[PDB]
Amino acid sequence: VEPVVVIDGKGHLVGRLASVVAKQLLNGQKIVVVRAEELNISGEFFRNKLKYHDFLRKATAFNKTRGPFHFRAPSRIFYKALRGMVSHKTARGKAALERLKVFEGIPPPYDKKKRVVVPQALRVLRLKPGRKYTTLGKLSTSVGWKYEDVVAKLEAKRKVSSAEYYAKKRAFTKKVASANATAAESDVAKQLAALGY
Amino acid sequence: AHFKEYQVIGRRLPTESVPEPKLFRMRIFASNEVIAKSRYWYFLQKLHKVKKASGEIVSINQINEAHPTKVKNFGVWVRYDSRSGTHNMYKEIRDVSRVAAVETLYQDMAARHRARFRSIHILKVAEIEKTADVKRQYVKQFLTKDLKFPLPHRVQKSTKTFSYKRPSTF
Amino acid sequence: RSKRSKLVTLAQTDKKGRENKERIFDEVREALDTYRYVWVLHLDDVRTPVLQEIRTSWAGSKLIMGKRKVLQKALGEKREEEYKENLYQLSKLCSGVTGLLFTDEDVNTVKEYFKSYVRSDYSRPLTFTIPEGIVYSRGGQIPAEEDVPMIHSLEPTMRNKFEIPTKIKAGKITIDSPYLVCTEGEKLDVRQALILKQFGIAASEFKVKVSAYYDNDSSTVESTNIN
Amino acid sequence: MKYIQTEQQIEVPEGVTVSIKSRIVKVVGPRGTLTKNLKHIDVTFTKVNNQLIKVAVHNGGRKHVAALRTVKSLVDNMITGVTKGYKYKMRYVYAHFPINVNIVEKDGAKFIEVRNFLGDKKIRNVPVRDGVTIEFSTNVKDEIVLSGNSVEDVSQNAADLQQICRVRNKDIRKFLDGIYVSHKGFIT
RNA sequence: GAAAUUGUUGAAAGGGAAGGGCAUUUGAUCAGACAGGCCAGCAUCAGUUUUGGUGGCAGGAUAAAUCCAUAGGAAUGUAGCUUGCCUCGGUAAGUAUUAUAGCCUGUGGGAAUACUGCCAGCUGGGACUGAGGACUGCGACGUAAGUCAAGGAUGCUGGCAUAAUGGUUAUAUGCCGCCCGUCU
RNA sequence: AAGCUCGUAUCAGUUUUAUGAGAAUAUGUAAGAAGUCCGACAUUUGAAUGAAGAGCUUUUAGUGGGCCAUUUUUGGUAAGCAGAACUGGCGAUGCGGGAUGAACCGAACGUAGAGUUAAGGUGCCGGAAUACACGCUCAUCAGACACCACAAAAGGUGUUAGUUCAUCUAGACAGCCGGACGGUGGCCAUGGAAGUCGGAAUCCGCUAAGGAGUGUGUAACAACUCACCGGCCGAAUGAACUAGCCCUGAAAAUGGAUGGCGCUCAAGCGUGUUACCUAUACUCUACCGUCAGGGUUGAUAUGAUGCCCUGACGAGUAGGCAGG
RNA sequence: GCAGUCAAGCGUUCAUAGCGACAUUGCUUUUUGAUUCUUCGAUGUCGGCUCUUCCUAUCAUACCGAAGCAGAAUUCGGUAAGCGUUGGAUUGUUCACCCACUAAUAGGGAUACCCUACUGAU
RNA sequence: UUUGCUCCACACAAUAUAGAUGGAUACGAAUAAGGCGUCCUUGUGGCGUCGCUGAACCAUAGCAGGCUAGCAACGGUGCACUUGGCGGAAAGGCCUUGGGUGCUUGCUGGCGAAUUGCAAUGUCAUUUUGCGUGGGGAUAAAUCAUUUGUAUACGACUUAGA
């Protein structure tokens, strides 16, 4: 429906987000993803770390400079397990992934913009309670992403500036809501109340 | 499938010097009439040495249960032939009608013992009108009075893919 | 799965069953009609040779012990059901461990004999201590020459559950500081009861008490409330 | 088999207070304050009045229930830390070589130093944690006293030092020396 | 004065392959007819087919049920009564069988509905198709001449009359494709 | 293929009746005029079903290398193994699915359009639902398809559903305390051995219960505990066995795979209900082509191998036939 | 290996129509370390280097548990493959087996200019 | 090497889109919990209220959006100026003062729309570039050749030279 969609990757699941992201791509909704270090995976840390090490040991026997790249950072993990879902070798693939832009944290301009989610991939919904999961930021930090303390800091700055925004917006919407309330019990409003507004 | 209850009554053969072999009925569970008839011959062969050519149906009657509204804690005896040799069972159910109860039971055996419908003889199904004859706990715990319990963490299901709310259960 | 495995033995002993329960339930009612009196004796802490002694003492009387509700089975708790009349009232008062006595000689000799009968048993009374030196079988109650040292195997237990500071040099056991084991005028902790067991100190007075009696030909309850 | 619910209760005396937001628990009372996080175990609390409180599980499995009694065992220890406070005690023993024992406060870290283990030259530091106090023993030779409100903290600290003074390469059937605990009781 | 092969110019494409096949786009290029050729749309009907709503019917235990009346019973015990405390109602028992709630079984009553199946019952939306080429016949409407959904489609209207549709062709794109012949 | 005879014709990789040989399966024959009587008996003339035909004579081309699967049967550990016999698939044979294939499931082909399905599937690659519903399972290599990498025996204080035995408000089990006596330190054994270094035996009184005594351990003794009983608390609980999921059994070495991604109230395993996806297979329709049954020299006109009407069918190496 | 015993279980139901779990007993070239120099048709073509990487079921180097561990060192076992495993003596022959060092001297597997790969360069 | 290079607007040309055709509308944090209004003892406080999908919110009428008339209110909004702020993670945008400038569909009037002939995307946006426009702005390196040699297969890397 929109030109652009801006996903928060928090409390989310890699496979089940990758899937919908792929289909929305190949139907043509340009997508950006952010906060991928707040992402999550089913299964415990040790399981996911061993799944990563078994990939890690796989390179070309004779020359590693051409062989598989064991990318570390979380956005690139999500991109890995998305380009497995699309035909990157073709041109339709490459012209899908020229619609995908994946980041950590929320850099600009997107921090001022509307973050969304996907309910059919959330952890809290699409898992049972009383069950494990792994934080991707911690996993990447445990296999050599050397950056985790920094996105923390910038997330702090964005959080405080957004809370200071939220105060203003809450006050202003309080004012307009009080105004519309005072605008109530007036026939110009009562007609709309009859017609569902 | 969506099971049904069926009366089936059969008669060995009209024959000279043995007219009207006495009668043979069964209470039978199936989706339609034909599977009832086939299960009827299948169990009826087991009881004694007769066949479909040496057999015949008297008639059948579909059985609508008398009290749909009434909860009825049933208890049922079953024999079945598993992967290994056969063995028996008694189970305890809190369901509405015999048909919905056994429809749940066949699924339950299908889960817990890989019980397909062929190898599972309904020995008997019954009602337990009073308390103090239930043995199990996974029925008993629903029966105390003033009973209440919550449904936490309802997994809602949106049709849309995106949403703008970072949702909440309740 | 994931159970606590109940530990099993191969002992030649066997369990009691219900045959003993029905046996004593029969024998109580057997004693009832044949004997005249039915005495109730409240006693919670009793000794095996002492019970042997009092068993062999009174053959004219018959002492029997058993579970409370099995005695209620035999005698019958209510007035509505009982072996004979005017026993249900005595059925109520018997709260704790009780031993039933059946006499036919005299009502007064029974109540007075056990008030005369007093012994020395463990508290379960005065205070005691140990010196800050070598420890003995009594632990300084007697002269140390005739007092023999405790055996060194149980010294870790003294450290563990009696909590006492101790350290084992060559075979004499020793300590650095003394410890008053208990005080007077208070019912004892389990460590205090057990250390006076280990010393072998039955410092507590012991009297078996009576709470009531019965008599058939009168068919009445004798209320004798004494300790 | 989905026991439809199960419950335990935590009974509490008057003078102590407790307070719980979602699973974030605090205990404030005579000795002072304690706090713990329970966001990982997915249970539910409800108060009746002011001495008693019901943990509860709805529609739970065996593991999901076996959390519960452990939580009860946690919370009673928490409360009793504030009512009584806990007391452990160790003795620093030797055959031939007298141990040196020392508290040191460097950078406010309150380290515990030990030396002269069978004549070894190495210094072995054991730090001290929050909300736990240490006391060298009065009037008991070769003895040390611990005091605090957090059982887990004091016990972990007691374990650290007796692992750090651990003998290796040698036979404990002949060699004896090592710091262990006399007992584990309350302050009161 | 052909072909392999080679150069210059013009056009086009190009990240470890190329070439071919089905359809189309872009670009280049091109024949035919208007003095009736090309592309489309609307209505009605025919064939195949898909998908909705609504109507009438028969069945089974002439549904069971619900509902109404009716006898009896019991509790996961309702009122009421009784007891122990006690924040003076609130627990625990014991009573109590409708009482200051009600339920179950059994009998009886008259309907509806679901479920299944039937309609030569109606009615609508959407796609593909347009074959054949004076008439002949089984048919319906009717008093009727004649009319018609009756042995295969016609009518009305619009614009263009040009590289616009289409064809060829390089190329991109989706998908597919194992190198030819021969003995085994 | 060329003739001759039939034409509704003898027939059938087929059933049924009847009856044989050797229980079913399989296997054989009869189911009429070519038969019944000494000129008499026609399609109710002797069961069902189906029939682009059936038979006789002459001649012509190619062919006569086996493999695999089911069954009976012989051997063994059995093979990409051998001894025998029936049937089927291949080879000549495309196509949808099996991720891909000498052998599996489905289905045999003109060119095309629409429709509907098969086997297999519907998280994304990928057209089709992150449909609904009951359960289970959480694997430090989970598992994801029958025969297209399987192992059992068993082990498992992981989870579930069970069976059968047992105990129980006349007080089940957990947990705390006490009781847990004599001849007795039982017999020789010994230097010392007293409930336990040890061999033989192994009992009786009181008993609620207490063995000539499970472990702790003294040179001996001693002391402590449960197994055996009673108390204090009060509701269920224990033993054995079974079977589903799970772990283990169940290992190599260039870096490596449920097909990849990844998936855990699943996108897994077990079951059900509808809906949905698409193959040259099915239906309908136009056209081509052959083949067969029918009509058609007749004036006027042009083709008689021609024209017209109807129907069904179309793969195909060697080889054969006809038109080009 | 063969033959028993013990025998959880199985068998239209079953001891005894019969199998069978785990242990046990039967000597199998000698009861007092006396030895015995027993290599008895090794019928195949590799053998021996330059030299790279991988596996662990580790020979030392790590950290650990238990063992009569008083110590030193040793006997086993566990996680462990990060790093290391030699110089000579003897045969066409790999078969055969010593001396000494060191911490040890573990076992295994894997013409050539032409396009590719590798090492390097605009 | 003729006056080339740039930035302000603007008339015309081309070159194509991985594909605009009302708005990419801002908290964070948990989910066996929380948002919002409010009260006071400022709290892990109380009182009330909400959720069950954004099927919302904001915007929206005029010829693809004209010319005009007023009524009422001091507002909203565009455009270029102007003031002071804020933000470095990939800020390249978000605020705010001042006026100017319009339009107002907040309410009520008048005029015009035809003929594209019943529809045919019925062209409205935005990338890049060029040639011309009339107005400001600044008027350099590198390579080769040569020489060295810290380098050296040839190239290259490093140096020097008005």
DSSP string, A82-107: HHTTTTTTSHHHHHHHTSEEE-SS--
Per-residue CB contacts under 7 A with strand F, chain A residues 41-70: 41-44, 46-47, 50, 54-55, 57-62, 67-68
Nucleotide at minimal C1' distance from the C190 CA: F177
**A1 CA – E155 C1', rounded, Å:** 45
Residues 6+ apart with CB under 8 A from A102: A32, A33, A34, A36, A75, A76, A78, A79
d(CA D155, CA D161): 10
Q: What is the resolution of this structure in A?
A: 3.8
Nearest to D61 by CA among D47, D76, D39, D42: D42
Q: Which two tokens stand for residue B30?
A: 């199936």
d(CA A105, CA A158): 9
Do B10 and B40 contact (CB within 8 A), yes or no?
A: yes
Do D124 and D164 contact (CB within 8 A), yes or no?
A: yes
**Using alpha carbons only, what angle is made at residue B14 by residues B12 and B16, rounded to the nearest 5 degrees?**
120
Domains of chain A by start residue, with CATH? 1-147 (3.90.1180.10), 148-197 (1.20.5.4280)
Contact between the CB of C50 and strand F at under 7 Å:
no
Nearest to D155 by CA among D114, D188, D124, D184: D184
Q: Which nucleotides of H are covered by protein (CB under 7 A)?
A: 18-21, 23-34, 36-38, 44-45, 51-55, 57, 88-94
d(CA C173, CA C133): 8
Contacting residues of D for C132, CB less than 8 Å apart:
none
Residues 6+ apart with CB under 8 A from D151: D77, D81, D86
Q: Are strands C209-215 and C39-42 parallel, antiparallel or unpaired?
A: antiparallel
DSSP strand E in A90-153: where?
A: 100-102, 133-135
Nucleotide at minimal C1' distance from the A1 CA: H24
Residue in D with minimal Cα distance to B152: D58
Residue type, A87: S
d(CA A29, CA A1): 8
Three-state DSSP state, C219:
coil
Residue type, D154: V
Cβ separation A120–B164 shorter than 8 A: no
d(CA C150, CA D78): 41
d(CA D103, CA D136): 9
Nearest to C130 by CA among C122, C121, C139: C139
Rg (CA), chain C: 24
Domains of chain B by start residue, with CATH? 2-68 (3.10.20.10), 69-145 (3.10.20.10)
Neighbours of B89 (CB within 10 A): 13
Q: Which residues of B33-52 are buried (b: 16+ CB within 10 A; e: fewer)?
A: eebbbebbbeebeeeeebee
Do D157 and D126 contact (CB within 8 A), yes or no?
A: yes
Q: Which two tokens stand for residue B81?
A: 């032939």
Residue type, C139: G
Element (H, E) at C102: strand C98-102
Contacting residues of B for D1, CB less than 8 Å apart:
137-138
Contacting residues of C for D139, CB less than 8 Å apart:
177
Do B98 and B52 contact (CB within 8 A), yes or no?
A: no
Cβ separation D182–C165 shorter than 8 A: yes
Cβ separation A129–D61 shorter than 8 A: no
Q: Which two tokens stand for residue C137?
A: 């079988």
D window 59-88, beta carbon within 8 A of B: 59
Contacting residues of D for A130, CB less than 8 Å apart:
42, 60-61, 63-64
Paired residues of D7 in beta bridges? D56
Distances (CA, A) of B153 to A11, A41, D59: 15, 20, 12
Residue position matching structure tokens 């309802």? B154
DSSP 8-class letter at A195: T
d(CA A43, CA A2): 34
Contact between the CB of B22 and strand E at under 7 Å:
no
Rounded to the nearest 10 degrees, what angle do helices C19-34 and C68-75 cross at? 50
Q: Which two tokens stand for residue C133?
A: 């030196």
Nucleotide at minimal C1' distance from the C154 CA: F223
Contacting residues of B for D60, CB less than 8 Å apart:
none
DSSP 8-class letter at D98: P
Q: By the CB < 8 Å criterion, does B143 face chain D?
A: no
d(CA C154, CA D183): 17
Q: Which two tokens stand for residue D155?
A: 């016990």
Q: By the CB < 8 Å criterion, does B141 face chain D?
A: yes
User: Are there at least 3 beta-carbon pairs closer than 8 Å between B and C?
Assistant: no
Do D6 and D62 contact (CB within 8 A), yes or no?
A: no
Q: 3-state DSSP helix/strand/coil percent for chain A, to nearest 5?
A: 55, 10, 35
Contacting residues of A for D61, CB less than 8 Å apart:
130
Contacting residues of D for B141, CB less than 8 Å apart:
3-4
Say yes or no: domain D86-188 is CATH 3.40.50.720.
no
Do C158 and C136 contact (CB within 8 A), yes or no?
A: no
Long-range contacts of C220-225, Cβ-Cβ distance < 8 Å, separation of 24 or more: C220/C86, C221/C86, C221/C89, C221/C90, C222/C107, C224/C111
d(CA C167, CA C177): 12
In chain A, the N- to C-terminal Cα span, in Å, equals 24
Nearest to B67 by CA among B95, B43, B39, B89: B95
Residues 6+ apart with CB under 8 A from A61: none
Contacting residues of B for A129, CB less than 8 Å apart:
153
Paired residues of C226 in beta bridges? C210
**CB-CB: which of D1, D5, D59 is closest to B138?**
D1
DSSP B74-129: EEEEEEEE-SSSEEEEEEEEEESSHHHHHHHHHHHHHHHS---GGGEEEEEEEE--
Nucleotide at minimal C1' distance from the A86 CA: F125
**CB-CB: which of B137, B142, B149 is closest to D58?**
B149
d(CA C209, CA C43): 7
Paired residues of B81 in beta bridges? B86
Residue position matching structure tokens 């139907």? A27
User: Considering only CA atoms, which residue is closest to the C1' of nucleotide H94?
Assistant: A112
Residue position matching structure tokens 């056994």? B102
Residue type, A1: V
Q: Which residues of C158-193 are buried (b: 16+ CB within 10 A; e: fewer)?
A: bbeebebbbeeeeeebebeeebebbeeeeebeeebb
Q: By the CB < 8 Å criterion, does B156 face chain D?
A: no
DSSP 8-class letter at C57: H
Residue position matching structure tokens 């309670």? A129
Residue ranges, comma separated, of all CATH 3.90.930.12 domains in chain D are 1-85, 86-188
Do B27 and B36 contact (CB within 8 A), yes or no?
A: no
Nearest to D100 by CA among D129, D77, D120: D120
CA-based nearest distance B108→chain A, Å: 21
d(CA D113, CA D126): 6
Q: Which two tokens stand for residue C173?
A: 């056991």
Do D60 and D88 contact (CB within 8 A), yes or no?
A: no
Structure determination technique employed = cryo-EM
CA-based nearest distance D157→chain C, Å: 21
Q: Which residues of B105-143 are buried (b: 16+ CB within 10 A; e: fewer)?
A: bbeebeeeeebeeeebbbeebeebeeeeeeeeeebeeee
Residue type, A153: K
**Inter-chain contacts counted by CB atoms under 8 A, chains B and D:** 13
CA-based nearest distance A57→chain B, Å: 37
Do C147 and C138 contact (CB within 8 A), yes or no?
A: yes
**CB-CB: which of B153, B161, B167 is closest to A20?**
B161
Do C148 and C136 contact (CB within 8 A), yes or no?
A: yes
Assigned fold of D1-85 = Outer Surface Protein A; domain 3 (3.90.930)
Nearest to A120 by CA among A19, A43, A1, A197: A19
**D176 CA – G97 C1', rounded, Å:** 51
Nearest to D81 by CA among D161, D10, D16, D21: D16
d(CA B161, CA B42): 51
Nucleotide at minimal C1' distance from the A109 CA: H93
Neighbours of C216 (CB within 10 A): 16
Residues 6+ apart with CB under 8 A from A90: none
CA-based nearest distance C101→chain D, Å: 45
Q: Which residues of A46-84 are buried (b: 16+ CB within 10 A; e: fewer)?
A: eebbeebeeeeeeeeeeeeeeeeebebbbbbbbbbebbe
φ/ψ region of B9 (left if φ > 0, alpha if ψ in -120 to 50, else beta) reads: beta
**C12 CA – F226 C1', rounded, Å:** 13
**CB-CB: which of D141, D182, D183 is closest to C176?**
D141
Nucleotide at minimal C1' distance from the B169 CA: H31
Do A45 and A138 contact (CB within 8 A), yes or no?
A: yes
Paired residues of D6 in beta bridges? D57
DSSP strand E in D41-167: where?
A: 44-47, 52-60, 86-91, 100-104, 111-115, 124-126, 132-136, 144-148
Neighbours of D19 (CB within 10 A): 10
